[PDB]
Write a protein that binds this ligand. Structure first.
Ligand SMILES: [Mg+2]
Ligand SMILES: [Mg+2]
Ligand SMILES: [Mg+2]
Ligand SMILES: [Mg+2]
Ligand SMILES: [Mn+2]
Ligand SMILES: [Mn+2]
Ligand SMILES: [Mn+2]
Ligand SMILES: [Mn+2]
Lengths: 387, 387, 387, 387
């Protein structure tokens, strides 16, 4: 029951099941995994592919010979399993050199280094077949108001992304970029804090068509925002290139719980939206098995991630197909929301006495929207109290 | 000391000092104010101008006869005091007909009425000399996930704003639009919930140059966001058409405290940015004198808005003029942040061995950023523990 | 399926289904209900009883003759339906006289008036058979730091509750008090903001055994706190006299959604706790049908409140009875949490080399807690993906 | 200007200026500090004393031989500088053995070890002259609902603290305990999450007079609570045994900024309360110099903690001494709040017709509270826009 298959396109970062459990207040509770181990075990669970930071795969400061050895083992594991690498990213946050940022560090030499580190991993990503390159600017921001002129920092952020777009275009690489927003942590405030800010920023890049967003469930919820709404605006703008799935319990530190945990009803509405929009990208889990767990718990957590997606997919499909939900959607006038307000145009609207001079505002006010019946039908379907 | 003059461009909504004190749990504590008396009292306190919703000035339902008398009185009061009207807006949220929204109501006849109500007041705003027309879509949104398909709602929101742009251009009006974001309240989630979401949406309008943002301090802080950072991004994009100043204590109901209250250091950094950037628009206060106050308390709170801006302006100017602060900014490499990362171009960066192959990452990592010393100088200046 | 019966002890305030839809930004969307109407319609839906503020039932400023008439109609409705009145409360928040509080208003004459208004409604509550008297201090607090000396206000709050306890004891009334915490709204901060603060305060009253708490789901969640955890501490202290059930989407304005909405997994764990602890009080819904709804939506929302409790009760019972959940609870050592740490006493512990000198800290660290398997079993049961 | 002296009783944890900068996403940016060098550098800056976790002073695993050398060195450094040790505490959160808690671990052998580790350090704290022993149960809590039965966990927490009280009383030690609350991080939810929850729990201990709270500014603000109000309730209950001063920007990860940063007006009102109440305990800073800083930045940030306290103390004293402020407090009836509501007793209140039957509710409602004028005087004093 609810068995994932590679066709469900479930992917996992090496750093997810690989998280050793170090948090701001405690040491690691688990040994490091070999990336070859993670590839083989995820394949056995039904995953479609894996993702990585350069530093997950290639120890920082590896010689070129050592780099080749690390990639070759990972290679062979992918070939043996049929696992894909649909996305890759750069670690510009762990090493102390990035303590004030990568692309927006105040020091210019750090900013040049960050671009060279990124470009080097784009080459590797393309070699392994990645279609999407993710950027999470986790150190781009500030704790204090004077440390960062945000207009200058946005200039520097635009400069970095324009240069990366020039690089892939000149190389002829078939790869697109996705910006992963986060409002805060580890910096007091992070630049481009939400999906909305990242979408706005993309429109000022030199080749906007190369860039989209990689929203993460828990990050939008860390600002108290509605994640399905934000995904809808990304889809509306044609910019949902990738998605990070996990769980989060409201406004606090970034929990990265397994998908389904945290806000369960938001997860239901998210899956409803992704499936009915026909989103065809990877369903990527950016999550951390809690550090209370041993390795059996790590694999149980990863499996629960895909199981919960599949359960919610079934309930949302059953919800949309229910004849009673049907009628309720017509009763709440969802079909009328999808029709133009004024396809007759401005002059016709201005000359329409039914729209103002003769509009019965009190009769219109008295109409119930019947949203509560509709929502309890959705609740019933989520809980399996009807089919 | 710290006396406002109309050269300071402080403006106030009629609905601010006129708020009668009704909240979700209580009845009014103050009598309604005659719009003409508010104009005179604000002029006596040093204000530059006033703003209004249609329904603040003209009682809803007013005959075309009565409407004319109300405007004539108001225009006369303006002439007598001088007072400007730099901005106006539409009430699309109080009347029960708007309970599911104005521009994005599921019912099409409500959406057409909302547009007709807005266009009528655009004509009046232009007659009164308003340069900016604000839209706060307070009822656009949802309490439950199935009640609103957000892609269709954004289509309807775009349709509405495109029609408004066609109206003002066809009339030859020289007025611009400013979208006021808010994340929630009175709806469970409001569409376009932050500055970033509104900036992204503007780029998909037919004539984006006609539209900018009217951010409010307390609204971005209701999502835990850094209001000065969001202002900087609006300035960077060329879209800060107007601003709403008030105070808010973190993530809760929308408090609308007088400016200075709430988050005092964020207020300091906001004023630093506005004055440093040379923002020349109105300094508008969207605030509510607490309902504990009588009418003397109303005017004290309004005066406090302007006084707090003026104190912060002084401290931020002293901060930026301080030779010691200028040296601390250089020590933190803020001047290097204003440096192009790679004005030499992609190929030159790729060939620069000092940016990667020969970069001493450990020496760069050892550099302190000196941010804490800079921030304590900023604290000393704000508190007047130096000059 | 999932039909409520009076035996489920579901109760509703008159002000819940009676809410006319006025919010901080909009007028009422629904007409007032006659309390007789609400009693009869709730009985038909399967409710056990109703609750009321004095001002819900008796128009403020009613003469004693008018008061008698209003109670008699309500009376007869209760007799006709078999509906009980298990709890009553005082409105000390709506009238402008309470704008700085009731029990902790700065003005002493308001504080005396608030006590007299309260005592008068205790008499009526006892006459109608109420066992619990609730106090929600919604106006007790401040917007600014100097307006309220909190030590003096707590003295005044203790004084008020001590006098009420004296009154009921002298009268011989069989009634207990329950304090309903809320962190904020309509005041910027409210005194006794959480369950924990109210429990602490009760221990300083003259007769603590007379007082307990009435926690509300959405209020604890407005502080980002775990509601099941807070209920567990109230049960642990023997102080859970009453409970308010509803839904809330994280940290924002008080939504009062129907129970089940908001945080669905917290609702599951709350019902699990209440049922397995054998809580035998009323399951009271303090909720507001959204103002988008007509009266059909009002009754659908109220019905959904009880339906969702009954669904979650079934899933939590099935969860606890599942032999596989059994074994998983033993695997996570929940049974070991229930055993004393040191029933051998302090000296035996100090002399136990296995507890320190010879404790294998690394072997103990390596034990997985198996919490993720346990939690996915709970998820499966909630979603009906097993039985 | 604003120079600290040891008479100001500023203290610092070894782990504060010694924080190496490791966070969940990054490695250390600073080398470890020798405890002796921290003691000397803090003494040079004007500090009164230092505090420590067992594992800050003695490396975990140290032989009984090595342990003695470490304390001898530290004691000598204390003697040389003078420096006090007013408080000590146990690290029950870093080692992986504590991944499910110390006192409330599900595994009983871990709970016994946690107690033995604590008792060993209580002996050392007493040898060094500590008067307060702090417990922050950072790992007590849960990520998921089924992992912890909270009633059993509170039984185990009470058992632990009762054993500690029996130990110190049996030894004749003159040390008291202070529970440090935190709502979340590193656990999804932490038990006893706020000041109020901890105060309530203390009343159920065997010897409650031995236990109080050690509240931290940023921890109560992580739940959106008003830290000065929570301090007032602790003072009211006689339980403020110690305090942790730092800064926090609202509801997010625990920032531990230097005192003054974060919420500046809350800092002002806290200092006003502490000094007005005559709190004579340590002014302790639980802060982390941001990891952007080198060692010069570490000491600048530490100096900034003490400087900001001293500036606020000056402004709060000027505020309270101002005859104009004293008149504004009378105008807002703060002196009436200090009035018994009904010192004449229950019967007299019931017979007082002026308190109900003849109370003019409309006249009382018309009284303004003059809070905004009072609050602007407080703003002027904080900013030094008057003296
Ligand atoms: Mg992510
Ligand atoms: Mg506004
Ligand atoms: Mg309630
Ligand atoms: Mg602390
Ligand atoms: Mn995350
Ligand atoms: Mn607002
Ligand atoms: Mn509520
Ligand atoms: Mn902290």
């Amino acid at each position: 029951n609810y068995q994932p298959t590679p066709e469900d396109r479930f992917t996992f970062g090496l750093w997810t099941v690989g998280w050793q459990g170090r948090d701001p207040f405690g040491d690691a509770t688990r040994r490091a995994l070999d990336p070859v181990e993670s590839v083989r075990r995820l394949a056995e669970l039904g995953a479609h592919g894996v993702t990585f930071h350069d530093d997950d795969l290639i120890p920082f400061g590896s010689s070129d010979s050592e780099r080749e050895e690390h990639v070759k083992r990972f290679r062979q594991a992918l070939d043996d399993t049929g696992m894909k690498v649909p996305m890759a990213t750069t670690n510009l946050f762990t090493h102390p050199v990035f303590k004030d940022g990568g692309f927006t560090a105040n020091d210019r030499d750090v900013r040049r280094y960050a671009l060279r580190k990124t470009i080097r991993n784009i080459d590797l990503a393309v070699e392994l077949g990645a279609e999407t390159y993710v950027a999470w600017g986790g150190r781009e921001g500030a704790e204090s108001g004077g440390a960062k002129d945000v207009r200058d920092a946005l200039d520097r952020m635009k400069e970095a992304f324009d240069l990366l777009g020039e690089y892939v275009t000149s190389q002829g690489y078939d790869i697109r970029f996705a910006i992963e927003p986060k409002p805060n942590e580890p910096r007091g405030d992070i630049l481009l804090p939400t999906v909305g800010h990242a979408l706005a920023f993309i429109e000022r890049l030199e080749r906007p068509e190369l860039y989209g967003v990689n929203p993460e469930v828990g990050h939008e919820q860390m600002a108290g925002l509605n994640f399905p709404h934000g995904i809808a605006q990304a889809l509306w703008a044609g910019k949902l290139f990738h998605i990070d799935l996990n769980g989060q319990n409201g406004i606090k530190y970034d929990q990265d719980l397994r998908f389904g945990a945290g806000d369960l009803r938001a997860a239901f509405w998210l899956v409803d939206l992704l499936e009915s929009a026909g989103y065809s990208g990877p369903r990527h889990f950016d999550f951390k098995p809690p550090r209370t767990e041993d390795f059996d718990g790590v694999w149980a957590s990863a499996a629960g991630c895909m199981r919960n997606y599949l359960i919610l997919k079934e309930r949302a499909a059953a919800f949309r197909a229910d004849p009673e939900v049907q009628e309720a959607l017509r009763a709440s006038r969802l079909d009328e929301l999808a029709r133009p307000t004024a396809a007759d145009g401005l002059q016709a609207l201005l000359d329409d006495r039914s729209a103002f001079e003769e509009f019965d505002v009190d009769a219109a006010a008295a109409r119930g929207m019947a949203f509560e019946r509709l929502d309890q039908l959705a609740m019933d379907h989520l809980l399996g109290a009807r089919g």
